[PDB]
Symmetry: D3
């Protein structure tokens, strides 16, 4: 049974990548409130990691990405077919691990949240490949489905074993939108160079440019080319800057940071979470 080794090799590859430090901080922060017992908390952490990583392996294939956090994407080393099988294998390894929580609502919640993630991803993929730019409201809505999938899996499972009956769903929605838009910004403003444009996807900045200059189809046409061409990409970033789309993403990110601090105090404060949000906000201005 070194079948398991071969099957999990693409996953193990991805564990080299950065990302666990922030996932750890989030669990610790939210456990400040939920006060979940050590044994259940670790199964929940393990499970979160597996599903998150499983879904990143798949997103990279859906998105024809080249790098992730400075590293080549699993499937550019091992191939698409091996990575798909492996990611899916790992999803069901997660489900197996969830059953070790031995709580009758755990699998019910796991299903709900994985169904929600797939709706978020579905829409993203749908808009891109059928060339229908979403409205800003549509976009935010699917980001809450995408990111609320894993956000709400983690805190939902924790809640099964917590006495903390205050409402976190609003705060999770803010942090979801925050991570995603922050990501959308980073990708086009500083993964390799402007991958989101090669992907052809509609991210926060490109959406803004599209609706801000409706006589133009320039961004749409560029996204449709799925181009690796550095000069086209450069021209496009120059264009978003002119139309004020980076500006508008910056301000959207400042408001979401404000709201996060507002929502955290509403729950009595959480210094560790404020620290992480302040640290993650460094990446504008």
């Amino acid at each position: 049974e070194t079948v398991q080794r071969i099957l999990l090799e693409p996953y193990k590859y991805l564990l080299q990548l950065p990302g666990k430090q922030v996932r750890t901080k989030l669990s610790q922060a939210f456990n400040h409130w939920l006060k979940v017992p050590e044994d259940k908390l670790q199964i929940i952490i393990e499970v979160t990691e597996m599903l998150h990583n499983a879904s990143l392996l798949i997103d990279d294939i859906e998105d024809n990405s080249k790098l992730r956090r400075g590293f080549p994407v699993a499937h550019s080393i091992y191939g698409i077919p091996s990575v798909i099988n492996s990611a899916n294998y790992v999803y069901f390894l997660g489900l197996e691990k969830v059953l070790t929580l031995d709580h009758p609502d755990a699998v019910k919640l796991f299903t709900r949240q994985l169904l929600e993630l797939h709706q978020g991803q579905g829409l993203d993929i749908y808009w891109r490949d059928n060339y229908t730019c979403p409205t800003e409201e549509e976009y935010k809505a699917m980001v809450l489905q995408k990111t609320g999938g894993l956000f709400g899996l983690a805190v939902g499972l924790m809640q099964l074993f917590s006495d903390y009956k205050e409402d976190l769903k609003p705060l999770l929605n803010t942090l979801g939108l925050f991570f995603q838009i922050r990501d959308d910004y980073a990708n086009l403003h500083s993964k390799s160079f402007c991958e989101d444009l090669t992907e052809g996807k509609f991210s926060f900045p490109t959406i803004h440019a599209i609706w801000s200059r409706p006589e133009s189809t320039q961004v749409q046409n560029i996204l449709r080319q799925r181009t690796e061409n550095i000069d086209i990409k450069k021209y496009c970033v120059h264009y978003l800057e002119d139309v004020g789309s980076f500006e508008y993403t910056r301000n959207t990110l400042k408001e979401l940071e404000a709201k996060a601090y507002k929502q955290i105090d509403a729950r009595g404060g959480n210094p560790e979470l404020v620290a992480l949000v302040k640290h993650l906000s460094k990446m504008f201005k």
Copy 2:
């Protein structure tokens, strides 16, 4: 939420393709022993259909196929990204259907059987993409995992609601192997022309041809070309025929048919299932 409609369009497309008749027949066949109550049986039939199709959606991306049962492969119409997301989605819709059985071991078994399916696909993919031809025993072993995933799911779930506690795994193993090698044989002997050679996969007839003639590295090299060229395929089938690898697969399918019947009689017989196995065996 006409989003649901969009997310399931690849799945709905695939429900047009032939297949249900034989999945339906098996369910009736096994329920002659298992005698599952009607409300639980439909939930099971629905769940089997979803997971089976979902895995086909993916297998075709994994395998780069062009046709399935005479239809274009889903992703050749809606694109890979969409089809992956939609197959994975239906997996979970399947999990959610399974919770409605309201049996404490249903999920446990569901999990076990998918892990297996995936351990089986893993190896198929691994050997193909890393150019390690499996031995016949290794090949058979993973088929039992690949097919055993779903066969064992359908029947495992049924047994949760049954007082038939006899062991059906040996029979499922034979059926699994029978379906797969049948498949393998049809593919290269009668999907479009020899898709398995274009996929580069090791199937029963080529596994035999490789180990049978170790002077020659010719079939390995042809697989590795992942070619659509019909003249290369024709040459290859001609070689498989000459080394008697189609004869060998026929004699393996004949042994399996006959083992099916003996494992069915060991269980108290089943006309319905013997009909299915005889009907499927006309192909050799």
Copy 3:
């Protein structure tokens, strides 16, 4: 200047293709009413030939076609750069020839009709390449511009030298739509097999299918694949038939043919033209 020979070779090649006997019948059919003097009429006949062929040479590059009227498309032999320059050269040889009519409103009309052609094609290309399926009204609208460009050029230049001042634009619009929709139908129902589906374009049958079954985005996605794959094409033609798109197209064509006859008897009859219209109608 045997440069003239190299520059014009692509155009010369295109003149081996069928299509003149139709252009000639129309010329004669309208001249029944217009009764243009021979000297002017021959110049017009030549101008219409140059501009039409020049525009087809470009359409084939725009549309990525492989064959026209059973013959390889010009650029497939001579390459795209040489064809673009050649077609454009011929446009201006067209203009130079229009100048030999010596009618002050000649160039003015010529300019207007070519601008109109480019509007129709501009929309065709746009919808296709930015993936926006037109409503049926929108589509008819651009066909009128596309076909009307050269239809109206030929008859326009003729009417400058005629005493026949009755209005032919309604009849030409009916003839425009008729030729195009007929084209659209023959392309998908009987150029190589279903080239329009490989082009990715939206044609009358595919337009119907898309608004007729709004749950399904299937035709959109096939058009988006720009595929040569014969099975996808077969699958698509099967769907258009199931949803009633070919029937629908055949009805539109019938109403237009009817309307053609009404607009001809509106003008005082034209047996040469009713002949061409009945002949071209045999196709459905």
Copy 4:
């Protein structure tokens, strides 16, 4: 009819590029001689601009170019099919504009000049794509038809509304060559990306010289045939042009031409604004 907006978008995209400044200067300079009424002169400039730009849009497609004056080429944003049609439309917008001059010979001359432009491009494309290298005299001969197409249109139309009876074709020929050869040098020696002319496979002045100058080598012909984007082959190729003296040869041709333009300007009684432009454009070598 927003149809015109879609039609004109690629053309509008090209109008962002540099190039108008030099066109404006030449119009002013030749009007020192031709003294064309400003009503007519505006119309002529607008027509010059339309046809010039339309012909670049097309040339970029013909020449598989990636940049022009530092910008992506229109067809790389909007697709080949859209820009062919857009460009062709603009040609006929051009014709329509020319008719607003109300001169019975305006269109005759329009036609004559585009037909000549088209002969020039024809030979350019032909030699490249049928792998026949032209002689230097052959090349110069076509450059006069290509560049003389548009020069002769601007100045020919102007002459329709002028009493200036002195002959300008020789000076325009000299300018034709100067601009084109200057281009050919800049392209390989220094807007367009690295050595695009090599990737095109075209026979330009320095390659032409290097081919006949060393008939025992077929290495330049063969590199041009490869249509390569490989930066090493291109670097290798420019080394060879420099070793064989093709860049020195081009520089002296360009000096000879600059001298001729000054002598020819002087025969027409001087033109300080044209000398300013020639002198400015000569800094380049």
Copy 5:
């Protein structure tokens, strides 16, 4: 050393292909005059085959060919790198075999002929890939280098051990040209469909079409495309036929056959060769 088996597999693959039966018939034909001992003659036949086959392996890589004598070309199965090394290896096995003749001129001749073979191939490729169509006299002269390379090795080695010193080079030239031009005609008239067009090579009929019709650059342009499109090829074969290229080649082949009979009868006749040339000539 099972390295040898792997090293030689591509070569052994090609030994399945038709082509031996003629090479033998020839050897027998010339031994009718040269009367070589059968210990030397066998070693010579073995050297002929090795160098011919090895040179065909390379020619198929050079010419991007898909089939040879109905079979897939070696490198389409084993990959170019392996076949390049395998062919070169067999060249030096050939020289190894040549040394076992112990003739002190064997190697001098061996070298002259391969050097000559390579100057012919070199010219074929140079014209093709730098797009310079050769004149008819230029073509024929390289065909004499290309075919005479091997023809002149077989017979030149045989003559080292013969008391027959009457000159055979004029007959070997006639034969060389007879074989190649027969080939060129079969390719474009009856390997899969018109591969010589896909290759882009200038063959005897394409050469006639080009110079015969110097206004047209249609055949040059089609060859430059390096296309697999059945229609462009079809169109092309039609053009060659209309321009009379196929007639012209039939007559050139007729005249060589006659010149073959006169040069054989010049040498005292040779029924067994008049037999093969007759047999061959049936094809026009």
Copy 6:
């Protein structure tokens, strides 16, 4: 015959590359021992040069390389077919020059060494393209055949006209390995960036990485990609450094260097060759 000009162009090109200066310093180093008369020695150096260059022309095609010693590979300028022919031609021009030595064992040795070389080459190719990584010892064995091919031809031919009967093959083997492994290290540790990974080849450092960490299939999968992607290459190089493969290669090269010195002292010393080896060692 300007034929020889065209045919030799790819060769003549490659002579622009650095590499002679080492080949000349080797000749002199060994001629300190062998003391070969000058007319014979010049012929040997020319023969060495031709066959070494001809073989590099083929290697670059086999290995799908872009650069060699900072210049473009021949076939990227002239195309693959022309270089294949030009390379093989030079081989036989080399056989011809060999015959000018007038030694009855010259062609026998020539043949033995080229055969030897093609055996090494074929194995490198075999492993790469059939995805069987060799063992360190296997690899070392084929390197001896590959490099020994040419090394042994130079020194073997020199020895035919030498009174020096001491055994050199142990020192040639040490050098052969030294040269190749030093190449394998440069290639990955400092040709464009890590061309070896794009090629897919198993070179000393990657072989170490593969066996050093058998749970991982990461280096194999990377090599399988035949990638140009700089990020995958960078990743890979970091991985090799983490597994200690560059240290490992460095210590092997240090062992080979010191062995060389022992072997040279065994033969009486050779300052010129010590100086050469010392210089080549500055690179680790």
